[PDB]
Structures are given as C-alpha cells and as structure tokens.
C-alpha cells in the first residue's frame, strides 16, 4: 500500500493472504467472512489477458500473518482451498465489473487473537456509511510504490470516499454501480492508495451505531498508484451481497 504505515498487531484479523502454491509467491489478499469462507477479487484468480487462471489447487490461504516473510509458526494458519466461486458476470473483457469471488476452505479455521471475521454490510449500514467523505481503510502487503519495494509488514491507509462523478471523470474505464472509488483529491494535500499486489484486500469501515467493522469493498484496480487525480476503485461489496449468500447457504 502506498503511503501507508505498519499495521498494529491484531488490528485487522480478517486480513488473509492468497499465496500461489509454487512458486511460493504472494498474489493477492482477502478476508475471512466466516470460519470457512474467504472473499477475494475475482481477477486474482481469473484474468485471461494475462493468462491468469488459478484453480483451488495452485493456491493456498494464510490467516493471521503480520510479517510478509516469516512463517509466524504459532499465530498464522495455512489453509487449503476447497472450491472457488467467480461471479458469473465478472466482466474481465471490459472494466473488471463484479470483481468478486469466494473460496471455500477445506477445513474450517479456529479463531485466535489474530484470526477473526469481518461483517457484511446490511442495507442500513451500507446506506448510512457509504457516503462521500467517509473514510474507510485499506490493508495489503502489495507494493509500497507505483514503481521501484514490498513491505516486511502489513500496511494501512485510510482514504475518504470520493463523489461518484469525481470518480467518473477520474477515468476512461466505464465505472459501474458495483464500484466506488476512494482517495484524496489533489488539493486535500494528503495521499495514500492501494497499489498492485493489494487486490482482494478489504476496504473496511467501523460503525458508529454498533462498533462492528464492515467490509464495504475490495481492492479492484486503478491507474498507476497514488497518481494525482486518479482514484483507486473498489468492488461494491454491498451490491453483490445476494450472490454472496446465494452461494454460501447454497453448498
């Protein structure tokens, strides 16, 4: 994450690592929405223009990690994918619309001080908290800079939500209803952004009415990183809430 700070420890227990089996390389991030399911960005799994196609076998999850490197032996959990679920109309041929995907873990995780699920917004939360100006916060082990540089530890950056029209004009790609962009404007003389490597990583907001944290979005894409006048786009987690549950309480 560009212009972030080292995550405190146990600050974002829902943060997951999506690691490709071998080469053992870090590909994206994700969240624990329960003890059996991890939510991520579809494109982490599927992106043909880049001959990207993972199956519940070339990958594996890592939960409760802090350090990007050290296998934190009595903290972290290495879990294995059971099944994957890419959104049926996840538009990779256009704007990466519906960048959502789900992974069913084989054997359930055991919540520890360092491993605990985030909540999915209910219409009321979503409705009152998804408003321009509100700040939410990203977390990832992705590149710290657009170019030239990988953290040793999880990072954070709180970015305010931007007005759709500002986002809209922010770029050439067709922005949809199932997207929000967030970041500082050029004059707010503040910066921060999620960068490449950050996908799947959660965009969470804390609630005033009850104090629970809520996955409002997912690091989808963006142009460059921390560029001026560009915003980082996020999946509208709310907006694909039914597919989320249609699949889960499915099987």
């Amino acid at each position: 994450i560009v212009e972030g700070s080292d995550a405190e420890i146990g600050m974002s227990p829902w943060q997951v690592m999506l690691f490709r089996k071998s080469p053992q390389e870090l590909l994206c991030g994700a969240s624990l929405i329960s003890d059996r399911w991890v939510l991520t960005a579809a494109h982490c799994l599927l992106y043909p223009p880049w001959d990207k196609n993972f199956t519940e076998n070339d990958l594996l999850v890592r939960i409760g990690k802090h350090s990007r490197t050290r296998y934190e032996r009595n903290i972290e959990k290495i879990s294995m994918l059971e099944k994957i679920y890419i959104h049926p109309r996840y538009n990779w041929r256009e704007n990466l619309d519906r960048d959502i995907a789900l992974m069913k873990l084989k054997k359930p995780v055991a919540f520890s001080d360092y491993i605990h699920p985030v909540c999915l917004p209910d219409r009321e939360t979503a409705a009152s908290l998804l408003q321009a100006g509100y700040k939410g916060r990203v977390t990832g082990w992705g590149n710290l800079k657009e170019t030239w540089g990988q953290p040793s530890v999880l990072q954070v950056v709180n970015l305010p939500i931007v007005e759709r029209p500002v986002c809209k004009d922010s770029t050439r790609i067709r922005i949809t209803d199932n997207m929000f962009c967030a970041g500082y404007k050029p004059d707010e003389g503040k910066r921060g952004d999620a960068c490449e490597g950050d996908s799947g990583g959660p965009f969470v907001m804390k609630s005033p009415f009850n104090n629970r944290w809520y996955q409002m979005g997912i690091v989808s894409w963006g142009e460059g990183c921390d560029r001026d006048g560009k915003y980082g786009f996020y999946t509208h987690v709310f907006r694909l809430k039914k597919w989320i549950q249609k699949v889960i309480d499915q099987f």
């Binding site: 700070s5 405190e8 420890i9 146990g10 600050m11 974002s12 227990p13 829902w14 929405i33 329960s34 003890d35 059996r36 399911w37 919540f111 001080d113 360092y114 605990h116 699920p117 985030v118 909540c119 999915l120 908290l129 100006g133 509100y134 700040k135 939410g136 916060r137 954070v156 709180n158 305010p160 907001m205 804390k206 005033p208 104090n211 629970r212 944290w213 809520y214």
Partner: peptide
C-alpha cells in the same frame, strides 16, 4: 463463523483503540 464478526479481540474487546481508528469516526461526526 460470523455473529461475533467485526469485533477485534485485541481492541474492541480489550477496549483499546487502534492508533487511527479514530481518524475514521471523527470523519462522520464532522
């Protein structure tokens, strides 16, 4: 799973504030 969702055990539960969680809350009152 999710019922005890979104309550970090080393914070919300110990009643500690993460070093910036506050930047977010003030962001709404204002």
């Amino acid at each position: 799973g999710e019922a005890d969702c979104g309550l970090r055990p080393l914070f919300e539960k110990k009643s500690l504030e993460d070093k910036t969680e506050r930047e977010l809350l003030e962001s709404y009152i204002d």
